[PDB]
């Protein structure tokens, strides 16, 4: 789903690492493994490349028909990942 954050990543994390495939889980089973969970994949520097490129192209003709003299093109995108630009 795209548009709103969901807990779907949490549920998968609840299914892979916890060895509850055995079948024995208590009522408070969620409480102890909270450190293990709440974990998501790390955004690799490549992911920024496709994400950044899409915003331009999916907004305008950036890099389309562009032309300069005896030089080369340049265009930059700023992402506010976490609390660090």
């Amino acid at each position: 789903v795209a548009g709103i954050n969901t807990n779907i990543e949490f549920l998968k994390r609840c299914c892979e690492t916890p060895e509850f495939a055995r079948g024995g889980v208590t009522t408070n089973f969620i409480s102890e493994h909270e450190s293990q969970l709440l974990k998501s994949p790390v955004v690799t520097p490549e992911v920024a490349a496709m994400a950044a490129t899409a915003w331009l192209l999916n907004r305008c003709d950036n890099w389309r028909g562009a032309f300069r003299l005896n030089s080369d093109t340049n265009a930059t995108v700023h992402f506010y990942i976490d609390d660090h630009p």
């Binding site: 305008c60 003709d61 950036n62 890099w63 389309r64 028909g65 032309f67 300069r68 003299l69 265009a75």
Partner: peptide, 8 residues
Amino acid sequence: DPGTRFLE
């Protein structure tokens, strides 16, 4: 405008 041309 972005995505446009220039001449210098």
